[PDB]
Design an enzyme around this catalytic site. Structure first.
Site, PDB file in Angstrom:
ATOM      1  N   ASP A  27       2.177  -7.405  -8.714  1.00  0.00           N
ATOM      2  CA  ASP A  27       1.270  -6.441  -8.133  1.00  0.00           C
ATOM      3  C   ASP A  27      -0.043  -7.175  -7.765  1.00  0.00           C
ATOM      4  O   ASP A  27      -0.333  -8.246  -8.309  1.00  0.00           O
ATOM      5  CB  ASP A  27       1.027  -5.301  -9.107  1.00  0.00           C
ATOM      6  CG  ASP A  27       0.116  -4.227  -8.536  1.00  0.00           C
ATOM      7  OD1 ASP A  27       0.409  -3.764  -7.408  1.00  0.00           O
ATOM      8  OD2 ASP A  27      -0.853  -3.859  -9.238  1.00  0.00           O
ATOM      9  N   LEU A  28      -0.825  -6.626  -6.813  1.00  0.00           N
ATOM     10  CA  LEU A  28      -2.103  -7.215  -6.439  1.00  0.00           C
ATOM     11  C   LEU A  28      -3.248  -6.430  -7.113  1.00  0.00           C
ATOM     12  O   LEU A  28      -3.960  -6.986  -7.961  1.00  0.00           O
ATOM     13  CB  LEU A  28      -2.301  -7.306  -4.931  1.00  0.00           C
ATOM     14  CG  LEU A  28      -3.391  -8.276  -4.453  1.00  0.00           C
ATOM     15  CD1 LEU A  28      -3.257  -8.521  -2.965  1.00  0.00           C
ATOM     16  CD2 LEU A  28      -4.810  -7.793  -4.769  1.00  0.00           C
ATOM     17  N   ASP A  29      -3.460  -5.179  -6.698  1.00  0.00           N
ATOM     18  CA  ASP A  29      -4.672  -4.480  -7.107  1.00  0.00           C
ATOM     19  C   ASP A  29      -4.667  -4.163  -8.607  1.00  0.00           C
ATOM     20  O   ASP A  29      -3.759  -3.528  -9.082  1.00  0.00           O
ATOM     21  CB  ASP A  29      -4.825  -3.205  -6.273  1.00  0.00           C
ATOM     22  CG  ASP A  29      -4.742  -3.436  -4.764  1.00  0.00           C
ATOM     23  OD1 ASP A  29      -5.429  -4.312  -4.244  1.00  0.00           O
ATOM     24  OD2 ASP A  29      -3.974  -2.715  -4.115  1.00  0.00           O
TER      25      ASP A  29
ATOM     26  N   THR B   2      -9.438  -4.965  -7.396  1.00  0.00           N
ATOM     27  CA  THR B   2      -9.479  -4.092  -6.239  1.00  0.00           C
ATOM     28  C   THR B   2      -8.967  -2.699  -6.595  1.00  0.00           C
ATOM     29  O   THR B   2      -9.165  -1.787  -5.834  1.00  0.00           O
ATOM     30  CB  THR B   2      -8.740  -4.705  -5.066  1.00  0.00           C
ATOM     31  OG1 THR B   2      -7.517  -5.299  -5.551  1.00  0.00           O
ATOM     32  CG2 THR B   2      -9.609  -5.718  -4.362  1.00  0.00           C
TER      33      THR B   2
ATOM     34  N   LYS C   9      -3.046   4.977  -9.162  1.00  0.00           N
ATOM     35  CA  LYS C   9      -2.797   3.529  -9.145  1.00  0.00           C
ATOM     36  C   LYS C   9      -1.354   3.239  -8.765  1.00  0.00           C
ATOM     37  O   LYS C   9      -0.441   3.891  -9.277  1.00  0.00           O
ATOM     38  CB  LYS C   9      -3.146   2.859 -10.458  1.00  0.00           C
ATOM     39  CG  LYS C   9      -4.611   2.948 -10.856  1.00  0.00           C
ATOM     40  CD  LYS C   9      -4.873   2.156 -12.100  1.00  0.00           C
ATOM     41  CE  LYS C   9      -6.351   2.102 -12.474  1.00  0.00           C
ATOM     42  NZ  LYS C   9      -6.620   1.589 -13.846  1.00  0.00           N
ATOM     43  N   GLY C  10      -1.144   2.283  -7.885  1.00  0.00           N
ATOM     44  CA  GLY C  10       0.209   1.949  -7.457  1.00  0.00           C
ATOM     45  C   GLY C  10       0.843   2.779  -6.349  1.00  0.00           C
ATOM     46  O   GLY C  10       1.852   2.398  -5.808  1.00  0.00           O
ATOM     47  N   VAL C  11       0.230   3.905  -6.019  1.00  0.00           N
ATOM     48  CA  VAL C  11       0.762   4.896  -5.102  1.00  0.00           C
ATOM     49  C   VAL C  11       0.287   4.555  -3.690  1.00  0.00           C
ATOM     50  O   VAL C  11      -0.847   4.121  -3.498  1.00  0.00           O
ATOM     51  CB  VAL C  11       0.305   6.314  -5.597  1.00  0.00           C
ATOM     52  CG1 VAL C  11       0.612   7.416  -4.616  1.00  0.00           C
ATOM     53  CG2 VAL C  11       0.938   6.560  -6.983  1.00  0.00           C
TER      54      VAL C  11
ATOM     55  N   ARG D 130      -0.876   4.814   0.384  1.00  0.00           N
ATOM     56  CA  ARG D 130      -2.059   5.432   0.950  1.00  0.00           C
ATOM     57  C   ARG D 130      -1.843   6.950   1.183  1.00  0.00           C
ATOM     58  O   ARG D 130      -2.598   7.804   0.730  1.00  0.00           O
ATOM     59  CB  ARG D 130      -2.484   4.729   2.210  1.00  0.00           C
ATOM     60  CG  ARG D 130      -3.847   5.123   2.725  1.00  0.00           C
ATOM     61  CD  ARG D 130      -4.206   4.423   4.005  1.00  0.00           C
ATOM     62  NE  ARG D 130      -4.006   2.960   3.921  1.00  0.00           N
ATOM     63  CZ  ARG D 130      -3.858   2.132   4.937  1.00  0.00           C
ATOM     64  NH1 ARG D 130      -4.020   2.535   6.195  1.00  0.00           N
ATOM     65  NH2 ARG D 130      -3.560   0.864   4.713  1.00  0.00           N
TER      66      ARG D 130
ATOM     67  N   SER E 247       3.200  -5.782  -3.670  1.00  0.00           N
ATOM     68  CA  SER E 247       2.122  -4.833  -3.489  1.00  0.00           C
ATOM     69  C   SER E 247       2.450  -3.768  -2.415  1.00  0.00           C
ATOM     70  O   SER E 247       3.008  -4.048  -1.351  1.00  0.00           O
ATOM     71  CB  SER E 247       0.858  -5.582  -3.070  1.00  0.00           C
ATOM     72  OG  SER E 247      -0.248  -4.713  -2.865  1.00  0.00           O
ATOM     73  N   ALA E 248       2.060  -2.559  -2.738  1.00  0.00           N
ATOM     74  CA  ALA E 248       2.131  -1.433  -1.825  1.00  0.00           C
ATOM     75  C   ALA E 248       1.041  -1.513  -0.760  1.00  0.00           C
ATOM     76  O   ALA E 248       1.082  -0.760   0.197  1.00  0.00           O
ATOM     77  CB  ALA E 248       1.978  -0.138  -2.602  1.00  0.00           C
ATOM     78  N   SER E 249       0.043  -2.385  -0.949  1.00  0.00           N
ATOM     79  CA  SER E 249      -1.140  -2.375  -0.066  1.00  0.00           C
ATOM     80  C   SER E 249      -0.922  -3.132   1.203  1.00  0.00           C
ATOM     81  O   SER E 249      -0.565  -4.311   1.220  1.00  0.00           O
ATOM     82  CB  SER E 249      -2.356  -2.970  -0.763  1.00  0.00           C
ATOM     83  OG  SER E 249      -3.465  -3.059   0.096  1.00  0.00           O
ATOM     84  N   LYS E 250      -1.185  -2.446   2.306  1.00  0.00           N
ATOM     85  CA  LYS E 250      -1.133  -3.071   3.599  1.00  0.00           C
ATOM     86  C   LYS E 250      -2.255  -4.071   3.779  1.00  0.00           C
ATOM     87  O   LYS E 250      -2.183  -4.920   4.644  1.00  0.00           O
ATOM     88  CB  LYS E 250      -1.103  -2.022   4.719  1.00  0.00           C
ATOM     89  CG  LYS E 250       0.216  -1.231   4.641  1.00  0.00           C
ATOM     90  CD  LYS E 250       0.314  -0.097   5.626  1.00  0.00           C
ATOM     91  CE  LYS E 250       1.647   0.643   5.457  1.00  0.00           C
ATOM     92  NZ  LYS E 250       1.637   1.933   6.198  1.00  0.00           N
ATOM     93  N   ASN E 251      -3.267  -4.025   2.903  1.00  0.00           N
ATOM     94  CA  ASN E 251      -4.366  -4.950   2.871  1.00  0.00           C
ATOM     95  C   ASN E 251      -4.070  -6.187   1.987  1.00  0.00           C
ATOM     96  O   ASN E 251      -4.924  -7.056   1.848  1.00  0.00           O
ATOM     97  CB  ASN E 251      -5.624  -4.200   2.409  1.00  0.00           C
ATOM     98  CG  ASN E 251      -6.084  -3.229   3.466  1.00  0.00           C
ATOM     99  OD1 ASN E 251      -6.462  -3.663   4.562  1.00  0.00           O
ATOM    100  ND2 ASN E 251      -6.059  -1.950   3.161  1.00  0.00           N
TER     101      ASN E 251
ATOM    102  N   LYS F   3       6.393   2.836  -4.487  1.00  0.00           N
ATOM    103  CA  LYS F   3       6.222   3.052  -5.937  1.00  0.00           C
ATOM    104  C   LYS F   3       5.966   4.511  -6.240  1.00  0.00           C
ATOM    105  O   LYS F   3       5.142   5.106  -5.503  1.00  0.00           O
ATOM    106  CB  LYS F   3       5.105   2.162  -6.519  1.00  0.00           C
ATOM    107  CG  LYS F   3       5.263   0.665  -6.283  1.00  0.00           C
ATOM    108  CD  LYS F   3       4.067  -0.163  -6.778  1.00  0.00           C
ATOM    109  CE  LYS F   3       4.186  -1.598  -6.331  1.00  0.00           C
ATOM    110  NZ  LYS F   3       3.064  -2.392  -6.862  1.00  0.00           N
TER     111      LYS F   3
ATOM    112  N   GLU G  66       2.076  -5.636 -13.681  1.00  0.00           N
ATOM    113  CA  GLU G  66       1.554  -4.384 -13.130  1.00  0.00           C
ATOM    114  C   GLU G  66       0.438  -3.835 -14.014  1.00  0.00           C
ATOM    115  O   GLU G  66       0.407  -4.052 -15.251  1.00  0.00           O
ATOM    116  CB  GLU G  66       2.674  -3.323 -13.067  1.00  0.00           C
ATOM    117  CG  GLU G  66       3.305  -3.195 -11.672  1.00  0.00           C
ATOM    118  CD  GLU G  66       2.394  -2.413 -10.725  1.00  0.00           C
ATOM    119  OE1 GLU G  66       1.396  -1.810 -11.227  1.00  0.00           O
ATOM    120  OE2 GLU G  66       2.761  -2.349  -9.529  1.00  0.00           O
ATOM    121  N   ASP G  67      -0.465  -3.084 -13.374  1.00  0.00           N
ATOM    122  CA  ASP G  67      -1.527  -2.364 -14.064  1.00  0.00           C
ATOM    123  C   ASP G  67      -1.374  -0.840 -14.038  1.00  0.00           C
ATOM    124  O   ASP G  67      -2.294  -0.165 -14.515  1.00  0.00           O
ATOM    125  CB  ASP G  67      -2.895  -2.741 -13.485  1.00  0.00           C
ATOM    126  CG  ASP G  67      -3.082  -2.183 -12.063  1.00  0.00           C
ATOM    127  OD1 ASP G  67      -2.121  -2.292 -11.235  1.00  0.00           O
ATOM    128  OD2 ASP G  67      -4.177  -1.598 -11.772  1.00  0.00           O
TER     129      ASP G  67
END
Ligand code: BG6
Ligand code: MG
Length: 218
Positions: free
Chosen positions: A8-10, A16, A45-47, A49, A114-118, A145, A169-170
């Site tokens: 995971d990233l964030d 982040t 968290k993890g969900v 956008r 990561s789920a993040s497009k960023n 997720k 994961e967080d």
């Protein structure tokens, strides 16, 4: 021995998750929804956008137009993207850079789940892109997720079975995603948020190759 680590990233690679929280809370309050506090945010968290915005609307039993929904998700993202412009290598969480180096030296694959497009932009901000053998594109998976798809995809991208992988994961959503993928989860955060049934560490300094081995051995 495990053959991949699925990151995971964030909230795992850097702080982040805090910025996603602040941005979602600001968005919620703009639309008159005040319930996005830290406790609620454990559900976000993890969900993705769109799923995040829908959880915030549901908290309030609020309905908006499709046009407004699209504008709100974009508004939050534009704010969040402004918040992260100054992220730098100095913001990498403790232990994470060394872990990436140690994994590469031991020929263990590294993939982003990561789920993040960023995510790709953030890895470039932190000078971490070159450590990653693969980045699973969250727009390619059919389910986000807590569905396991993104962890499964990360493992596949590096040629490693999920069952021979560790996921870091967080989040509640992400831990469930790792469980259902077949990978072994190691969570970072408070047991009262993340549960008493998996290995949890209080901060990322605990994420050493030595510890991942200690956990894998049992
Ligand atoms: O809006 P983005 O950057 O595509 O991020 C999607 C999400 O990515 C996850 O990594 C975060 O934990 C979530 O908080 C989040 O909503
Ligand atoms: Mg996270």
């Amino acid at each position: 021995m495990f053959k991949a680590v699925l990151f995971d990233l964030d909230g795992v690679i850097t702080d982040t998750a805090e910025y996603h929280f602040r941005a979602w809370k600001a968005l919620a309050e703009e639309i008159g929804i005040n319930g996005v506090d830290r406790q609620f945010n454990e559900q976000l968290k993890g969900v993705s956008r769109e799923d995040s915005l829908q959880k915030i609307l549901d908290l309030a039993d609020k309905k908006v137009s499709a046009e407004e929904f699209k504008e709100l998700a974009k508004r939050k993202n534009d704010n969040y993207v402004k918040m992260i412009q100054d992220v730098s290598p100095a913001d990498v969480y403790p232990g994470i850079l060394q872990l990436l180096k140690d994994l590469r030296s031991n020929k263990i694959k590294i993939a982003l789940a990561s789920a993040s497009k960023n995510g790709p932009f953030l890895l470039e901000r932190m000078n971490l892109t070159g450590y990653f053998d693969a980045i699973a594109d969250p727009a390619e998976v059919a389910a986000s997720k807590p569905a396991p798809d993104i962890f499964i995809a990360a493992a596949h991208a590096v040629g490693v079975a999920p069952s021979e992988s560790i996921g870091l994961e967080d989040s509640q959503a992400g831990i469930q995603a790792i469980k259902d993928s077949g990978a072994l989860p190691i969570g970072v955060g408070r047991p009262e948020d993340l549960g008493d049934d998996i290995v949890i560490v209080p901060d990322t300094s605990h994420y050493t190759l030595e510890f991942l081995k200690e956990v894998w051995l049992q």
